DNA sequence: TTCAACTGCTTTCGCATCCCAACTACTTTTCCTCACACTTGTACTCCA
Protein backbone atom coordinates (compact mmCIF):
# COMPACT_ATOMS: atom_id res chain seq x y z
CA UNK A 1 0.00 0.00 0.00
CA UNK A 2 2.93 2.32 0.69
CA UNK A 3 4.18 2.50 -2.89
CA UNK A 4 0.75 2.99 -4.41
CA UNK A 5 -0.39 5.45 -1.76
CA UNK A 6 2.74 7.58 -2.01
CA UNK A 7 2.26 8.76 -5.61
CA UNK A 8 5.37 10.95 -5.79
CA UNK A 9 8.06 8.94 -7.61
CA UNK A 10 6.11 5.80 -7.22
CA UNK A 11 6.18 2.38 -8.81
CA UNK A 12 2.48 2.32 -7.78
CA UNK A 13 3.00 -1.05 -6.11
CA UNK A 14 2.51 -2.95 -9.35
CA UNK A 15 6.18 -3.39 -10.20
CA UNK A 16 6.74 -4.69 -6.68
CA UNK A 17 3.96 -7.26 -6.88
CA UNK A 18 5.56 -8.15 -10.20
CA UNK A 19 8.78 -8.66 -8.25
CA UNK A 20 6.99 -10.87 -5.74
CA UNK A 21 5.36 -13.07 -8.36
CA UNK A 22 8.58 -13.53 -10.30
CA UNK A 23 10.97 -14.80 -7.65
CA UNK A 24 8.36 -16.58 -5.52
CA UNK A 25 6.73 -18.53 -8.34
CA UNK A 26 6.79 -22.09 -7.00
CA UNK A 27 4.47 -24.79 -8.36
CA UNK A 28 5.79 -27.31 -5.84
CA UNK A 29 3.51 -29.49 -3.77
CA UNK A 30 2.72 -28.68 -0.15
CA UNK A 31 4.28 -31.63 1.63
CA UNK A 32 2.04 -31.26 4.72
CA UNK A 33 4.16 -33.23 7.13
CA UNK A 34 6.95 -31.01 8.46
CA UNK A 35 6.28 -28.53 11.23
CA UNK A 36 6.45 -25.03 9.80
CA UNK A 37 8.63 -22.27 11.19
CA UNK A 38 8.61 -18.63 9.97
CA UNK A 39 6.49 -19.40 6.89
CA UNK A 40 2.73 -19.64 6.77
CA UNK A 41 0.70 -20.52 3.68
CA UNK A 42 -2.34 -18.22 3.50
CA UNK A 43 -0.52 -14.90 2.90
CA UNK A 44 3.09 -15.48 1.87
CA UNK A 45 3.66 -18.75 -0.02
CA UNK A 46 2.36 -20.01 -3.31
CA UNK A 47 2.44 -23.82 -3.60
CA UNK A 48 0.56 -26.00 -6.06
CA UNK A 49 -3.23 -26.06 -5.43
CA UNK A 50 -2.96 -22.61 -3.76
CA UNK A 51 -2.48 -19.45 -5.79
CA UNK A 52 -0.34 -16.96 -3.90
CA UNK A 53 -2.08 -13.91 -2.52
CA UNK A 54 0.43 -11.59 -4.11
CA UNK A 55 -0.29 -13.38 -7.39
CA UNK A 56 -4.02 -12.66 -7.28
CA UNK A 57 -3.41 -9.16 -5.95
CA UNK A 58 -1.19 -8.64 -8.98
CA UNK A 59 -4.11 -9.74 -11.14
CA UNK A 60 -6.76 -7.60 -9.50
CA UNK A 61 -4.64 -4.50 -9.09
CA UNK A 62 -3.44 -4.58 -12.69
CA UNK A 63 -6.95 -4.97 -14.07
CA UNK A 64 -8.16 -2.01 -12.00
CA UNK A 65 -4.97 -0.09 -12.88
CA UNK A 66 -5.54 -0.70 -16.59
CA UNK A 67 -9.17 0.42 -16.40
CA UNK A 68 -8.08 3.65 -14.70
CA UNK A 69 -5.54 4.24 -17.49
CA UNK A 70 -8.44 5.09 -19.83
CA UNK A 71 -2.84 -2.34 -22.45
CA UNK A 72 -5.66 -4.71 -21.51
CA UNK A 73 -4.35 -6.89 -24.32
CA UNK A 74 -1.07 -7.22 -22.42
CA UNK A 75 -2.75 -8.36 -19.21
CA UNK A 76 -5.02 -10.66 -21.22
CA UNK A 77 -1.92 -12.06 -22.88
CA UNK A 78 -0.33 -12.73 -19.48
CA UNK A 79 -3.39 -14.34 -17.85
CA UNK A 80 -3.61 -16.57 -20.94
CA UNK A 81 -0.06 -17.90 -20.24
CA UNK A 82 -0.76 -19.20 -16.67
CA UNK A 83 -3.82 -21.56 -16.83
CA UNK A 84 -4.18 -22.02 -13.06
CA UNK A 85 -6.09 -25.27 -13.40
CA UNK A 86 -6.90 -25.47 -9.69
CA UNK A 87 -8.93 -22.34 -8.86
CA UNK A 88 -11.83 -20.23 -10.02
CA UNK A 89 -10.69 -16.75 -9.06
CA UNK A 90 -8.11 -16.46 -11.83
CA UNK A 91 -10.74 -17.54 -14.35
CA UNK A 92 -13.11 -14.88 -13.05
CA UNK A 93 -10.37 -12.31 -13.60
CA UNK A 94 -9.74 -13.70 -17.07
CA UNK A 95 -13.46 -13.52 -17.76
CA UNK A 96 -13.56 -9.98 -16.41
CA UNK A 97 -10.70 -8.77 -18.59
CA UNK A 98 -12.73 -9.64 -21.68
CA UNK A 99 -15.83 -8.03 -20.20
CA UNK A 100 -13.90 -4.78 -19.99
CA UNK A 101 -12.99 -4.89 -23.68
CA UNK A 102 -16.59 -5.85 -24.45
CA UNK A 103 -17.66 -2.83 -22.38
CA UNK A 104 -15.25 -0.33 -23.93
CA UNK A 105 -15.71 -1.32 -27.56
CA UNK A 106 -19.52 -1.33 -27.23
CA UNK A 107 -19.94 2.38 -27.89
CA UNK A 108 -19.47 2.10 -31.71
CA UNK A 109 -18.54 5.79 -32.20
CA UNK A 110 -21.02 6.48 -35.02
CA UNK A 111 -24.20 8.20 -33.92
CA UNK A 112 -17.78 -1.67 -39.63
CA UNK A 113 -17.62 -5.34 -40.52
CA UNK A 114 -14.71 -5.80 -38.07
CA UNK A 115 -16.09 -3.65 -35.25
CA UNK A 116 -19.03 -6.03 -34.91
CA UNK A 117 -17.53 -9.50 -34.68
CA UNK A 118 -14.61 -8.63 -32.40
CA UNK A 119 -17.06 -7.71 -29.64
CA UNK A 120 -18.86 -11.04 -30.19
CA UNK A 121 -15.49 -12.74 -29.64
CA UNK A 122 -15.11 -11.01 -26.27
CA UNK A 123 -18.73 -11.73 -25.32
CA UNK A 124 -18.12 -15.38 -26.12
CA UNK A 125 -14.91 -15.38 -24.09
CA UNK A 126 -16.81 -14.07 -21.06
CA UNK A 127 -19.60 -16.65 -21.32
CA UNK A 128 -17.09 -19.48 -21.63
CA UNK A 129 -14.61 -18.38 -18.97
CA UNK A 130 -17.41 -17.66 -16.50
CA UNK A 131 -18.76 -21.13 -17.19
CA UNK A 132 -15.43 -22.81 -16.46
CA UNK A 133 -15.13 -20.50 -13.44
CA UNK A 134 -18.49 -21.70 -12.13
CA UNK A 135 -17.67 -25.36 -12.78
CA UNK A 136 -14.70 -25.14 -10.38
CA UNK A 137 -14.84 -24.88 -6.60
CA UNK A 138 -16.11 -22.11 -4.42
CA UNK A 139 -16.14 -18.69 -6.01
CA UNK A 140 -19.75 -17.56 -6.08
CA UNK A 141 -20.39 -14.95 -8.74
CA UNK A 142 -23.62 -13.05 -9.49
CA UNK A 143 -23.97 -15.14 -12.63
CA UNK A 144 -27.44 -13.78 -13.38
CA UNK A 145 -26.39 -10.15 -12.97
CA UNK A 146 -23.41 -10.48 -15.31
CA UNK A 147 -25.64 -11.95 -18.03
CA UNK A 148 -27.74 -8.80 -17.83
CA UNK A 149 -24.58 -6.83 -18.67
CA UNK A 150 -23.49 -9.01 -21.58
CA UNK A 151 -26.91 -8.72 -23.24
CA UNK A 152 -26.71 -4.95 -22.70
CA UNK A 153 -23.45 -4.93 -24.65
CA UNK A 154 -25.22 -6.55 -27.60
CA UNK A 155 -28.35 -4.37 -27.48
CA UNK A 156 -26.03 -1.39 -27.91
CA UNK A 157 -24.62 -3.37 -30.85
CA UNK A 158 -27.84 -5.01 -32.22
C1' DT B 1 9.22 -88.02 -65.67
C1' DT B 2 7.87 -82.70 -63.32
C1' DC B 3 6.86 -78.98 -58.69
C1' DA B 4 8.62 -76.34 -55.49
C1' DA B 5 12.28 -73.69 -52.28
C1' DC B 6 16.88 -72.27 -51.32
C1' DT B 7 19.88 -68.40 -54.35
C1' DG B 8 23.93 -65.41 -55.88
C1' DC B 9 24.29 -61.81 -58.78
C1' DT B 10 22.51 -54.78 -60.98
C1' DT B 11 28.07 -49.16 -59.78
C1' DT B 12 32.00 -46.66 -60.92
C1' DC B 13 34.71 -41.84 -57.17
C1' DG B 14 32.96 -39.10 -53.81
C1' DC B 15 29.60 -37.37 -51.07
C1' DA B 16 26.65 -38.07 -46.51
C1' DT B 17 17.46 -50.71 -11.87
C1' DC B 18 20.96 -46.79 -10.66
C1' DC B 19 22.29 -41.97 -9.23
C1' DC B 20 22.04 -36.71 -8.55
C1' DA B 21 19.69 -32.35 -6.51
C1' DA B 22 16.11 -29.09 -3.14
C1' DC B 23 14.68 -26.75 0.92
C1' DT B 24 13.60 -26.69 5.63
C1' DA B 25 14.38 -29.24 10.06
C1' DC B 26 16.89 -30.33 13.66
C1' DT B 27 20.91 -31.06 15.78
C1' DT B 28 25.22 -31.19 17.44
C1' DT B 29 29.72 -28.71 18.39
C1' DT B 30 31.40 -26.47 22.47
C1' DC B 31 32.29 -22.11 25.22
C1' DC B 32 30.89 -18.70 28.25
C1' DT B 33 27.53 -16.30 32.34
C1' DC B 34 25.47 -16.96 37.29
C1' DA B 35 22.66 -18.76 40.60
C1' DC B 36 20.91 -22.09 44.89
C1' DA B 37 21.19 -24.58 48.95
C1' DC B 38 24.08 -24.93 53.20
C1' DT B 39 26.49 -22.70 57.82
C1' DT B 40 28.69 -19.30 62.62
C1' DG B 41 28.41 -15.73 64.68
C1' DT B 42 25.85 -11.28 65.97
C1' DA B 43 21.87 -8.81 67.32
C1' DC B 44 17.15 -7.91 70.03
C1' DT B 45 15.59 -8.93 73.59
C1' DC B 46 14.33 -13.60 76.69
C1' DC B 47 13.60 -15.06 82.15
C1' DA B 48 16.38 -15.66 85.82
From Swiss-Prot:
Intracellular or extracellular location(s): Nucleus, Nucleolus
Signal sequence interval, chain numbering: none
Misc. comment: Present with 476 molecules/cell in log phase SD medium.
Record note on quaternary structure: Component of the core factor (CF) complex, which consists of RRN6, RRN7 and RRN11. The CF heterotrimer may further dimerize to form a hexamer. RRN11 interacts with RRN6, RRN7 and SPT15.
Role according to the record: Acts as a component of the core factor (CF) complex which is essential for the initiation of rDNA transcription by RNA polymerase I. After binding of UAF (upstream activation factor) to an upstream element of the promoter, CF is recruited in a SPT15/TBP-dependent manner to form a preinitiation complex.
Protein name listed in UniProt: RNA polymerase I-specific transcription initiation factor RRN11
Upper lineage: Eukaryota, Fungi, Dikarya, Ascomycota, Saccharomycotina
Range within the parent protein: 255 to 443 of 507
